[PDB]
PDB file of C-alpha atoms and ligand atoms in Angstrom:
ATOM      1  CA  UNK G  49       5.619   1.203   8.865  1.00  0.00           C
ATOM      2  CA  UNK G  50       7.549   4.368   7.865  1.00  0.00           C
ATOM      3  CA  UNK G  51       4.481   5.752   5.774  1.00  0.00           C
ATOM      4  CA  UNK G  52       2.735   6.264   8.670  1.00  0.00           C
ATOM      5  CA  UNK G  53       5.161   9.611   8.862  1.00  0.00           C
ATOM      6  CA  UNK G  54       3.214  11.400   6.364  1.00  0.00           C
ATOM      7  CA  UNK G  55       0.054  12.041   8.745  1.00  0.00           C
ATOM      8  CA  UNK G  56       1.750  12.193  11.552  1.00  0.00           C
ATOM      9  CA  UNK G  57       0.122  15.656  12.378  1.00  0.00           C
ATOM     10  CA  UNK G  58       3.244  17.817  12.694  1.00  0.00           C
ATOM     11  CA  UNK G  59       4.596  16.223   9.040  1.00  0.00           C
ATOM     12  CA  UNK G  60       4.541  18.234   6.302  1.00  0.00           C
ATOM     13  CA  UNK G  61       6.668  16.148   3.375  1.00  0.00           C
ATOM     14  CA  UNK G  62       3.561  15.016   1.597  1.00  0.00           C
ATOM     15  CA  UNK G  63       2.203  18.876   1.129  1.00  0.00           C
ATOM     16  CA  UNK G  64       5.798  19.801   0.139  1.00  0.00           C
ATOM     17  CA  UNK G  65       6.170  17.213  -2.265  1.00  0.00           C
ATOM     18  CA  UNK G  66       2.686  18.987  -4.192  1.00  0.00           C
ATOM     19  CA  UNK G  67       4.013  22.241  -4.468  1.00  0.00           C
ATOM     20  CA  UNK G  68       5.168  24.037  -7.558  1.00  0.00           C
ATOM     21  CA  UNK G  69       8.081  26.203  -7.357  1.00  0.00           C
ATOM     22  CA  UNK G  70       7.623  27.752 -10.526  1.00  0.00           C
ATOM     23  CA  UNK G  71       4.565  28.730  -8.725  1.00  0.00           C
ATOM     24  CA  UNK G  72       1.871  27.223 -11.407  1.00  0.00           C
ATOM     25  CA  UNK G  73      -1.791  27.756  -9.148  1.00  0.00           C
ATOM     26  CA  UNK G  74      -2.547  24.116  -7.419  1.00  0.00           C
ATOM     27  CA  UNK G  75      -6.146  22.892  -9.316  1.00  0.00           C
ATOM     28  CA  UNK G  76      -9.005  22.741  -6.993  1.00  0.00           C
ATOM     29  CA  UNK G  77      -8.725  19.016  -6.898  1.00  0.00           C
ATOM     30  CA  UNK G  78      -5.124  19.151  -5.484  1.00  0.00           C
ATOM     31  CA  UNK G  79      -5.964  21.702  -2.845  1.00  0.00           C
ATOM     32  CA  UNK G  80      -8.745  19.273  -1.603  1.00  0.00           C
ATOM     33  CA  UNK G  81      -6.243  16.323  -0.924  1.00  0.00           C
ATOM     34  CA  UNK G  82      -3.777  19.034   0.673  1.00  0.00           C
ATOM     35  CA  UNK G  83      -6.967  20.328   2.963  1.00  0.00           C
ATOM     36  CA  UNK G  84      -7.768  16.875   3.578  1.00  0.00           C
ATOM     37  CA  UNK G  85      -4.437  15.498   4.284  1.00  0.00           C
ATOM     38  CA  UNK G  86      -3.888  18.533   6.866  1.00  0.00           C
ATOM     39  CA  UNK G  87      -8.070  17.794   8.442  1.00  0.00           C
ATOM     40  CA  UNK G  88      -7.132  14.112   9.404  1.00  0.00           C
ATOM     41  CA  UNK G  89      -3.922  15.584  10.883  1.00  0.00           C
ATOM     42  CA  UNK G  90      -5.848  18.167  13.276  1.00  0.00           C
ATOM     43  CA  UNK G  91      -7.389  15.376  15.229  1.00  0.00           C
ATOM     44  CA  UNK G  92      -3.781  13.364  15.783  1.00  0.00           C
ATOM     45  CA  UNK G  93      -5.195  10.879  13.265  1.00  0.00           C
ATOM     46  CA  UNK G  94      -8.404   9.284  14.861  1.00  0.00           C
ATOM     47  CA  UNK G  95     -11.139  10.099  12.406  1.00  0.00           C
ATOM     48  CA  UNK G  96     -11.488   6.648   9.606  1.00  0.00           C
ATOM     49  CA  UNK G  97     -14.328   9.227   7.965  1.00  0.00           C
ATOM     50  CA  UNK G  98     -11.166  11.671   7.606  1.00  0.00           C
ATOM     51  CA  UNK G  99      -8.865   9.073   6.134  1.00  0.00           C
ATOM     52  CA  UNK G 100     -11.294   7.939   3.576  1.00  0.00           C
ATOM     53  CA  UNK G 101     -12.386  11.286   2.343  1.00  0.00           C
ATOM     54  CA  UNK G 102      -8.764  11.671   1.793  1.00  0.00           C
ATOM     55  CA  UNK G 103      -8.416   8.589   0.005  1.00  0.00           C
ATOM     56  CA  UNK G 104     -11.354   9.391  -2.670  1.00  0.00           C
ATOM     57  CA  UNK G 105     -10.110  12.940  -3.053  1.00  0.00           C
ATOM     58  CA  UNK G 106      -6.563  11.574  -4.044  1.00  0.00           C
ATOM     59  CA  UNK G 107      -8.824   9.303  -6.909  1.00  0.00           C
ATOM     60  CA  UNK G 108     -10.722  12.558  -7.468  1.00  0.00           C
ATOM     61  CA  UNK G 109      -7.106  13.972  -8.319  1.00  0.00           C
ATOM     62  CA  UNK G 110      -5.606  11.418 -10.277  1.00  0.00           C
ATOM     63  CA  UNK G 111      -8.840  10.959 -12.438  1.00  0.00           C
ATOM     64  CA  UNK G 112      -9.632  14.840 -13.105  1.00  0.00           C
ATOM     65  CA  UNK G 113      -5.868  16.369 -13.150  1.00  0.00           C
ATOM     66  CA  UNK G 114      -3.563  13.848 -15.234  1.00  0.00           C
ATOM     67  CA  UNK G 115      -0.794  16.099 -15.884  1.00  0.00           C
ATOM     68  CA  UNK G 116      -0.914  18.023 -12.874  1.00  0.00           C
ATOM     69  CA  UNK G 117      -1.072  14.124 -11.016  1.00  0.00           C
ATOM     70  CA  UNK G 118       1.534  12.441 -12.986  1.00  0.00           C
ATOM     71  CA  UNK G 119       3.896  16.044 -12.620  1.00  0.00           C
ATOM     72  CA  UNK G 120       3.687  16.431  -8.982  1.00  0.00           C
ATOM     73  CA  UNK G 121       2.478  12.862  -7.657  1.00  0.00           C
ATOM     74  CA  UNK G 122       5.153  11.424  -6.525  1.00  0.00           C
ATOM     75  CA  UNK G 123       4.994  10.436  -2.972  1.00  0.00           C
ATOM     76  CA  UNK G 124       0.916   9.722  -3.210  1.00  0.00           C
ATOM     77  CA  UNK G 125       1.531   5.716  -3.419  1.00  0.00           C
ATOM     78  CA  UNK G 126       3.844   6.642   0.263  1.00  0.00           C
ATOM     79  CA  UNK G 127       0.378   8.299   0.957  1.00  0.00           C
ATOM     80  CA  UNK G 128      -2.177   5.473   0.160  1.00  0.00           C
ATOM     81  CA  UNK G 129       0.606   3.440   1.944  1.00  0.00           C
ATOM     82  CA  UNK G 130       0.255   5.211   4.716  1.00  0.00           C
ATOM     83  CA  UNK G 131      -3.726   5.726   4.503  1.00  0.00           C
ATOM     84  CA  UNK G 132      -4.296   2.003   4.688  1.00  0.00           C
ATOM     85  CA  UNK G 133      -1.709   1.781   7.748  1.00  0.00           C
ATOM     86  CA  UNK G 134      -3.863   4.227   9.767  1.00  0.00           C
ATOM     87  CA  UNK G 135      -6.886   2.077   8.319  1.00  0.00           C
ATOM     88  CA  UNK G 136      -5.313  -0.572   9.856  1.00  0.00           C
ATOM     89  CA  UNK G 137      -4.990   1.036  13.351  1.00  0.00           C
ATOM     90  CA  UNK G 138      -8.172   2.432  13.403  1.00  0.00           C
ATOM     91  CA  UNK G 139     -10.205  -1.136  12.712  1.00  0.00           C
ATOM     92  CA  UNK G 140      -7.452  -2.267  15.738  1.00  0.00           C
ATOM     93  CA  UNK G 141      -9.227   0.363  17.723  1.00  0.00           C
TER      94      UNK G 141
HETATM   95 NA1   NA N   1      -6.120   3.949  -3.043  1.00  0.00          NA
END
């Protein structure tokens, strides 16, 4: 599944796709998923604890930071896409 790119540990897309040129400050919420995303990366994707911390935090994001979300959210459903592919792998063993 091409998804699975965005935590492959060297990929970067998903944090680019958060920034702000215009350089409006990130909310706290956002710069827990970016942490996050960037954590489950560190240990070449094996930790499912990881992966669903990052999963609540992007909920965390969506529910706290609408226009912030809606503005620079594009490539999260790619991310939960992606999330429940490593899920997937990581039940596999
Ligand atoms: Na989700």
């Amino acid at each position: 599944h091409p998804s699975m790119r965005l935590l492959e540990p060297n990929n970067d897309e998903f944090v680019r796709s958060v920034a702000s040129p215009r350089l409006h400050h990130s909310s706290e919420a956002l710069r827990e998923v970016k942490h996050d995303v960037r954590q489950f990366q560190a240990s070449g994707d094996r930790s499912l604890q990881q992966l669903r911390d990052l999963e609540v935090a992007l909920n965390h994001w969506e529910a706290s930071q609408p226009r912030e979300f809606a503005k620079r959210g594009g490539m999260v459903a790619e991310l939960r896409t992606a999330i429940d592919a490593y899920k997937q792998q990581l039940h596999e063993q």
